[PDB]
Design a protein around this motif. Structure first.
Motif: not given
Length: 39
Positions: A7-12, A25-26, A30-31
């Motif tokens: 993934x990239x980023x959603x929550x931050x 679901x996380x 961004x590892x």
């Protein structure tokens, strides 16, 4: 222990409830260069 996948980023990041109040679901993870283990 749990771990993301891709993934990239959603929550931050987190601040409170994000201290472990949700399922796998996380996408925030961004590892990429995980330590010595399965990629």
């Amino acid at each position: 222990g749990a771990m993301g996948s891709v993934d990239s980023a959603d929550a931050g990041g987190g601040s409170g409830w994000l201290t472990g109040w949700l399922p796998t679901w996380c996408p925030t993870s961004t590892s990429h260069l995980k330590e010595a283990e399965e990629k």
